[PDB]
Copies of this chain bind each other. A is one copy, B any other.
Amino acid sequence: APKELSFGARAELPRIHPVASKLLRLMQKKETNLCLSADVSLARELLQLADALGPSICMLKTHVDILNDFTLDVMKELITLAKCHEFLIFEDRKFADIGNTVKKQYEGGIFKIASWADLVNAHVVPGSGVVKGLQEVGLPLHRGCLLIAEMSSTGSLATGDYTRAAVRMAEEHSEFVVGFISGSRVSMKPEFLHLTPGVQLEAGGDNLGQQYNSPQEVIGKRGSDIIIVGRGIISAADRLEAAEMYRKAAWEAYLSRLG
């Protein structure tokens, strides 16, 4: 690798994207590189965790299509907490169709994602058309995309030349693409953000192919910026204490990589 810059230094890079830069500054302001994967089926419970975990997090990740009681005002209440506790909103929609379709799924329908989500992700299997169709909606609204360069699940096919291609598609769309979902550092340009799912303190998995690694491994050894943690916190008796442990473990793992 080359010489590691800090998040603050990174937020000021000439080729940096506005969304990433906003994120990075808050990562250094609050000493949090923890993304809370808020996997819940009630609007109310998503708002309760956002309000309480907010000070501990640099991002909130949502699957909005798991909410039973989704209304746009629930996203208006969630922007409030995001504006106030300071975190980005990341809708984990994983766009994966052709340009023309993804474009309408991003702007329209019942979810109106592009009107409240700073960040979305897209798979790269369709070719760059997915990104091109997304950028027509997201740019006008000052948004970024993350491109799924690798996956944490067993038997995942995002490896090899697949991964190299996500990275390419990202460079060539730097004006919209702000980084990656991956398991390690996949790009050498520091203007790109790395976010890693499949993270738990203790070694393990689930019964449907999720593989877990630890914050130290993911941030220290592998190069990630940020960790996405779901059940590792959400399941806990004390979700605040859980969030804090993951905060401190990831933060310190980053400090240690820096010098």
Contacts and interface: CB of A to CB of B under 8 A. Distances in A.
Nearest to A161: B157
A125 interface: yes
Interface string A198-236: 000000001111100000000000000000000000000
B101 A206 contact: no
A161 to B, nearest CB: 8
Contacts of A125: 123, 125, 148, 151, 156-158, 162
Q: Chain A's interface: helix, strand, loop or mixed, by majority?
A: loop
Q: How large is the interface on A (under 10, 10 to 19, 20 to 34, 35 or more residues)?
A: 35 or more
A153 B108 contact: no
B210 A100 contact: yes
Interface of A: 39, 41, 63-68, 70, 92, 94, 96-101, 103-105, 108-111, 123-130, 132-133, 148, 151-158, 161-162, 165, 206-210
Contact of A133 (B66, B98, B209): B209
8 contacts: A66-B109, A67-B109, A92-B97, A98-B152, A98-B208, A125-B156, A126-B157, A129-B155
Given A108-B66, A123-B123, A162 B157 contact: yes
Contacts of A124: 157
A97 B206 CA distance: 14
Contacts of A127: 151, 153-157, 209
Contact of A209 (B65, B98, B108, B152): B98
Contacts of A96: 94, 96, 123
